[PDB]
Design a protein around this ligand. Structure first.
Ligand SMILES: [Zn+2]
Length: 195
């Protein structure tokens, strides 16, 4: 099986937002709108905004899941490499095999799907705080794109789904991710190649 990556705003007008961090060679996380691609360093905070036109019901949740972008690899479960799954960098909540973690949210839940064996991490969808127009989730990616025996230089996508208390689909967005040592330089390079 293969999770859908089809963009779907749904009844609440769900969509993602990214900060504008630039491409200085020191930047740790940067988003390219032209490529729809997030570039980030290993295990660094990746701020992802959640935008809605109207408030979804209490019990609404937000799930993040990675799949391989290339169709010939799409049935492969995206997981941490044989090295990183064993480096004992557990935050006490995320299984060591999970590529994507949520940072600073004790209500985060991590799922090993009993049928697809795919990994995901889901949190309650919270309203914007006072004087804010959106909510922000902080993600960490726990492997390099280049990791041998894992992603192995294959591009991935992160799929973000808004779901109801039963886990039914309310909204979906997605973005490509590259976890690398120099996100700012790699963004400039890929944007140049695109041009
Ligand atoms: Zn790795």
């Amino acid at each position: 099986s293969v999770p859908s990556q089809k963009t779907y705003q749904g009844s609440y007008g769900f969509r993602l937002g990214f900060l504008h961090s630039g491409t200085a060679k020191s930047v740790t996380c940067t988003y390219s709108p032209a490529l729809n691609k997030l570039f980030c360093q290993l295990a660094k905070t990746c701020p992802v905004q959640l935008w809605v036109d109207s408030t979804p019901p209490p019990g609404t949740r937000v799930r993040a899941m990675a799949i391989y972008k290339q169709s010939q690899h799409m049935t492969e479960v995206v997981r941490r490499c044989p090295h990183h799954e064993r480096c004992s960098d557990s935050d006490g909540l995320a299984p060591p095999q999970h590529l994507i973690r949520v940072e600073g949210n004790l209500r985060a839940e991590y799922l090993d799907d009993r049928n697809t064996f795919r990994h995901s991490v889901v949190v309650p969808c919270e309203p914007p705080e006072v004087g804010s127009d959106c909510t922000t989730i902080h993600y960490n990616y726990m492997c390099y794109s280049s990791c041998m025996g894992g992603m192995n230089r294959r591009p991935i996508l992160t799929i973000i789904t808004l779901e109801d208390s039963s886990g039914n689909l309310l909204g979906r967005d997605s973005f490509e991710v590259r976890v690398c040592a120099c996100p700012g330089r790699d963004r400039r390079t890929e944007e140049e190649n695109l041009r």
